[PDB]
């Protein structure tokens, strides 16, 4: 009984119903099993958590939940009341009960209460009834859990949800100690690893948290999340999680990129990772092999919607389709939060070398520069080629989700190329807007 | 009479959907503008697959869209962009273009355009035997298409050399433009973006200069509020840097605004205020921004009752977006060559704070502490603005702006945090690989 799949848990434009239903189809195809509904900015999930769904909204959520059932995917409805719930007010607890029972009437059997990303200070009234913030959360989570009939899946997201958020540390946290003692054993707890966006989730870090919350956690993995940096996108493989974690966890739910169609690799490789050690206890997964397996499959989606010129006539612009090597390049340029893929790292390293040795144009090492320059111009050329062929693909829906990222990298790479050519001889200047001018003044 | 003023959907990336286009027509009418130019770079049958006829499904949507334009008294101009691919000398290829344009004509469209922007200047062998230059080639098919369609009242041509800096060797001596102005039939209008692609100013003398070589007044395709070229940028400042004296020297101004549809309230509203002011001293950009923002504000409380006690947790969602929030947001996402006053002021204060920061380690310590606290308050107003936007009832507007407002709030919080650090790990490597290449360019 392992919860593996996807949480729609990010800030910004949520996914629409058509996209969520298409997620369920992909999760089933790849032998995953769970979806957690938690879009930070879907209004009736968090900001207006008190408000019941309209008849129109009710119909859409019913339809969505029946679609999950049809694709053998567990639907878990989360609610986020912590910005403004008065925990001690039984009217307020009733309002929360009312909302979750409305969703229960749509056919949903699994639920979650989330208390992430709220400040830890209670109102006067709650400080008279509860001795700490943790007691307050645990009290209503426990009451809600039993009101719903102790459902087989019920998740709790702590305020201290990762190593670095734990005061003073994970193993001595008064907040976590109270959760692990008082939260009913049937309830699962969400955790993101040592950090919000964890480079690695070591097994010993999970032993440490497990003994204080007194269960194995479900991981809410933010490895492929991109709601925090407007320029970033993550198409690298699931990585930095040993397959030995699987027996030490209740699940992994990935919180992937905002742009729905960018999550093919993110979700596909997660499925490859889970499947590789589905039945372990106490070298099964290769990230690089999994990326390749995912990109080969993704490629087939690009040629699917969602005159022959003479010897001396202008040839078709549109003739060349996207190739596996284009997607390999794109993925290496938009790889992972703490690492670029091999080609990106290599281009970056070559450009730094070229620039730092550029004064040698002005005798032996000139042929080193010219040859390295030309090899670098070719690589920039492949980035423009990749953009050009993407731009011409039949799957417009995929193109539109990626577009502004692919344009950006192509655009910058063309400008870098142009600069290396300029080294070999000797309109949009405030790049990044106001935000960018403040960044340039910070340390790096 | 007969000045084309309105909006061109002419940008790179996700086009607008039909629901948004129809809502544009309603806004253009409200504000007394009159024209829409359909030219979305990446709508596949506009440019890349310009040869392909619309499907039955696609045809029905365009018919519906064109009827909606007619209902809102907006002229619908269909553009097509064949220049990536077209063999100009091949009459099969000319016929294919004719076929597509008469398909659109059958949807009820009476106005058209051929665009040759952003294509390389080199012809194929076969075209170089028939035409002596690139301009002759374009002008030949534009002329043939124009007369096949019965010399329609509105027909636009977009030149390859569409701005001062694109003209070889300069605007007044260009062999490309000379040929256009001589040979392009007089009934045809020509598009122009000013001295540059994104022009800070469009001076009157620059328009006299281009007018005498193309031998007409141009229609301006204005990119002042375009944002398809920098993913961090958004433009909510007012229409600015074009004298009202241009209006009698032009056939029109079509603005090519931000990709995010709901961000173009100010862009289009102030353009309308500018055109109306000298339709036949008159226009203040700052006054127009204010007029536009006060109208936009009313949209935020419209979709597209617990009362907490004295000592209970107050509602998070209680405070609505204010005019002063939108004034701040606009100044943070103002214009391509200028930030609005508040942004410039915050930037200037932060630079001063950082450059004098060694004074915490006697007289001008109180200058720093006082200036620091005044700066922390301003960063606080940015977070307030984000927070209230995040709670607004018009979710459609929120989602278009979201990632920009999150970004500025996020950076401003980090700057604040840094000023506090000057007194008493997950997203430091900001901007990915693109950003690391930028940091190495000269700036
Ligand atoms: C335990 C889950 N709580 C969290 N809340 C946030 C999510 O909404 C974001 O998408 C994620 C990445 O930016 O960062 C934190 S992780
Ligand atoms: C009127 C000449 N054509 C032009 N083609 C491009 C447009 O598609 C872009 O939106 C604009 C701003 O990036 O830059 C040029 S202007």
Short mmCIF file of C-alpha atoms in Angstrom, two decimals, chain A residues 11-14 41-43 46-48 50-51 83-86 89 91-92 119 121-126 195-197 227-232 307 312-318 332-333 338 340 344-345 347-348 351-352 355 376 388 391-393 396-397 399-401 403-405 407-409 411-413 415-416 419 427-444, chain B residues 12-15 42-44 47-49 51 83-87 89-90 92-93 120 122-127 196-198 228-233 305-306 311-317 331-332 336-337 339 343 346-347 350-351 354 375 390-391 395-396 398-400 402-404 406-408 410-412 414-415 418 425-434 436-443:
data_model
loop_
_atom_site.label_atom_id
_atom_site.label_comp_id
_atom_site.label_asym_id
_atom_site.label_seq_id
_atom_site.Cartn_x
_atom_site.Cartn_y
_atom_site.Cartn_z
CA UNK A 11 1.46 28.41 -6.66
CA UNK A 12 -0.17 30.11 -9.70
CA UNK A 13 -2.47 29.08 -12.52
CA UNK A 14 -3.94 25.74 -11.62
CA UNK A 41 -4.41 29.42 -5.79
CA UNK A 42 -7.60 27.59 -6.74
CA UNK A 43 -9.77 29.95 -4.65
CA UNK A 46 -7.16 27.87 0.53
CA UNK A 47 -8.10 31.56 0.42
CA UNK A 48 -11.88 30.86 0.50
CA UNK A 50 -14.95 28.18 3.91
CA UNK A 51 -17.04 28.58 0.74
CA UNK A 83 -4.28 31.39 7.08
CA UNK A 84 -7.37 32.31 8.97
CA UNK A 85 -9.11 29.46 10.84
CA UNK A 86 -9.90 30.08 14.48
CA UNK A 89 -14.30 28.02 17.37
CA UNK A 91 -18.56 26.97 14.21
CA UNK A 92 -15.31 27.17 12.29
CA UNK A 119 2.84 31.86 10.15
CA UNK A 121 1.34 32.69 15.66
CA UNK A 122 -2.13 31.92 17.00
CA UNK A 123 -4.90 34.34 17.91
CA UNK A 124 -5.66 35.09 21.60
CA UNK A 125 -8.71 32.77 21.66
CA UNK A 126 -6.77 29.77 20.39
CA UNK A 195 14.73 21.21 2.31
CA UNK A 196 11.78 22.59 0.41
CA UNK A 197 13.51 21.53 -2.79
CA UNK A 227 6.64 28.14 -9.31
CA UNK A 228 9.51 29.92 -7.50
CA UNK A 229 11.63 31.17 -10.42
CA UNK A 230 9.95 32.52 -13.54
CA UNK A 231 12.85 31.59 -15.81
CA UNK A 232 13.13 27.92 -14.75
CA UNK A 307 3.76 20.58 -52.48
CA UNK A 312 16.39 25.41 -57.16
CA UNK A 313 13.20 26.56 -55.34
CA UNK A 314 12.87 27.74 -51.76
CA UNK A 315 12.79 24.50 -49.65
CA UNK A 316 10.08 23.93 -47.06
CA UNK A 317 10.82 25.62 -43.72
CA UNK A 318 8.74 23.07 -41.88
CA UNK A 332 20.07 19.23 -20.59
CA UNK A 333 19.35 23.03 -20.85
CA UNK A 338 20.85 22.07 -8.65
CA UNK A 340 22.44 21.33 -15.58
CA UNK A 344 24.49 22.67 -20.88
CA UNK A 345 27.33 22.37 -18.38
CA UNK A 347 28.56 24.80 -23.27
CA UNK A 348 28.75 26.96 -20.19
CA UNK A 351 32.04 29.84 -23.09
CA UNK A 352 33.80 30.71 -19.79
CA UNK A 355 35.98 34.52 -22.73
CA UNK A 376 31.08 26.18 -29.68
CA UNK A 388 13.20 25.96 -34.99
CA UNK A 391 8.32 25.80 -33.45
CA UNK A 392 7.13 23.70 -36.46
CA UNK A 393 5.71 20.70 -34.55
CA UNK A 396 0.73 22.94 -30.52
CA UNK A 397 -0.36 22.35 -26.95
CA UNK A 399 4.75 23.92 -27.93
CA UNK A 400 2.79 26.60 -26.12
CA UNK A 401 3.62 25.35 -22.61
CA UNK A 403 7.51 28.25 -25.69
CA UNK A 404 8.74 31.13 -23.66
CA UNK A 405 11.53 28.93 -22.11
CA UNK A 407 12.60 31.16 -26.93
CA UNK A 408 14.60 32.48 -24.02
CA UNK A 409 17.46 30.00 -24.25
CA UNK A 411 17.65 33.97 -27.79
CA UNK A 412 20.45 34.11 -25.23
CA UNK A 413 22.48 31.43 -26.96
CA UNK A 415 23.57 36.46 -28.37
CA UNK A 416 26.44 34.48 -26.75
CA UNK A 419 29.67 37.60 -28.76
CA UNK A 427 16.21 47.37 -27.83
CA UNK A 428 16.14 45.06 -24.68
CA UNK A 429 19.18 46.20 -22.60
CA UNK A 430 17.48 46.34 -19.13
CA UNK A 431 17.08 42.52 -19.48
CA UNK A 432 14.82 41.04 -16.76
CA UNK A 433 12.99 44.28 -15.90
CA UNK A 434 13.06 45.90 -12.48
CA UNK A 435 13.34 42.54 -10.72
CA UNK A 436 16.57 41.92 -12.68
CA UNK A 437 18.11 45.22 -11.64
CA UNK A 438 17.59 44.37 -7.98
CA UNK A 439 19.07 40.88 -8.50
CA UNK A 440 22.27 42.32 -10.06
CA UNK A 441 22.85 44.27 -6.83
CA UNK A 442 22.56 41.15 -4.58
CA UNK A 443 25.42 38.66 -4.03
CA UNK A 444 25.75 35.44 -6.18
CA UNK B 12 5.43 35.29 -30.66
CA UNK B 13 4.07 32.46 -28.44
CA UNK B 14 0.68 31.37 -27.17
CA UNK B 15 -1.93 33.15 -29.20
CA UNK B 42 2.71 30.99 -33.91
CA UNK B 43 -0.92 30.22 -34.78
CA UNK B 44 0.17 27.46 -37.20
CA UNK B 47 2.84 31.52 -40.92
CA UNK B 48 4.50 28.10 -40.64
CA UNK B 49 1.67 26.29 -42.51
CA UNK B 51 -0.42 26.96 -47.32
CA UNK B 83 7.90 34.60 -46.47
CA UNK B 84 9.70 31.73 -44.66
CA UNK B 85 8.88 29.36 -47.41
CA UNK B 86 7.26 30.89 -50.52
CA UNK B 87 8.76 30.52 -53.96
CA UNK B 89 8.11 32.95 -58.97
CA UNK B 90 6.02 29.76 -58.83
CA UNK B 92 1.26 27.28 -58.13
CA UNK B 93 2.54 28.93 -54.97
CA UNK B 120 16.05 36.35 -44.19
CA UNK B 122 18.04 35.72 -49.51
CA UNK B 123 15.93 34.37 -52.36
CA UNK B 124 16.14 30.93 -53.94
CA UNK B 125 17.80 30.44 -57.35
CA UNK B 126 14.47 30.36 -59.24
CA UNK B 127 13.27 33.64 -57.79
CA UNK B 196 13.44 50.57 -33.84
CA UNK B 197 11.55 47.37 -33.31
CA UNK B 198 10.60 48.71 -29.88
CA UNK B 228 7.39 38.32 -26.09
CA UNK B 229 11.15 39.04 -26.07
CA UNK B 230 11.91 38.90 -22.33
CA UNK B 231 10.13 36.37 -20.16
CA UNK B 232 10.56 38.42 -16.99
CA UNK B 233 8.96 41.59 -18.44
CA UNK B 305 -19.67 35.98 5.70
CA UNK B 306 -18.07 34.83 8.98
CA UNK B 311 -9.47 38.28 19.78
CA UNK B 312 -10.05 35.77 16.92
CA UNK B 313 -7.94 35.25 13.83
CA UNK B 314 -9.00 38.00 11.35
CA UNK B 315 -10.03 37.12 7.81
CA UNK B 316 -7.07 36.88 5.44
CA UNK B 317 -9.15 37.93 2.46
CA UNK B 331 5.34 51.51 -11.70
CA UNK B 332 7.10 48.11 -11.14
CA UNK B 336 10.57 49.07 -21.91
CA UNK B 337 12.99 51.92 -21.31
CA UNK B 339 10.45 52.26 -14.61
CA UNK B 343 10.26 51.58 -8.83
CA UNK B 346 13.13 52.03 -4.54
CA UNK B 347 15.97 51.11 -6.83
CA UNK B 350 18.60 50.41 -2.34
CA UNK B 351 21.72 51.48 -4.31
CA UNK B 354 24.26 49.35 -0.22
CA UNK B 375 12.82 51.30 2.52
CA UNK B 390 -3.79 36.95 -4.51
CA UNK B 391 -7.22 37.29 -2.78
CA UNK B 395 -9.14 35.01 -11.00
CA UNK B 396 -8.64 35.37 -14.73
CA UNK B 398 -4.79 37.18 -11.32
CA UNK B 399 -3.58 34.21 -13.34
CA UNK B 400 -2.26 36.28 -16.24
CA UNK B 402 0.65 35.94 -11.31
CA UNK B 403 4.13 34.85 -12.07
CA UNK B 404 5.27 38.54 -12.52
CA UNK B 406 5.16 36.67 -7.43
CA UNK B 407 8.57 37.41 -8.88
CA UNK B 408 8.73 41.05 -7.82
CA UNK B 410 9.84 37.49 -4.02
CA UNK B 411 12.84 39.59 -5.03
CA UNK B 412 11.71 42.55 -2.97
CA UNK B 414 14.99 39.14 -0.53
CA UNK B 415 16.30 42.72 -0.96
CA UNK B 418 19.50 41.93 2.70
CA UNK B 425 20.42 27.82 -0.32
CA UNK B 426 17.30 26.62 -2.53
CA UNK B 427 16.88 29.52 -5.13
CA UNK B 428 20.12 31.64 -4.97
CA UNK B 429 21.24 30.50 -8.50
CA UNK B 430 18.28 32.46 -9.94
CA UNK B 431 17.34 32.16 -13.61
CA UNK B 432 18.79 28.80 -14.63
CA UNK B 433 21.30 28.23 -17.39
CA UNK B 434 20.03 31.21 -19.40
CA UNK B 436 24.35 32.08 -16.06
CA UNK B 437 25.10 32.96 -19.67
CA UNK B 438 23.66 36.46 -19.20
CA UNK B 439 25.92 37.15 -16.18
CA UNK B 440 28.93 36.49 -18.44
CA UNK B 441 27.82 38.98 -21.17
CA UNK B 442 29.16 42.55 -20.80
CA UNK B 443 26.05 44.47 -19.46
#
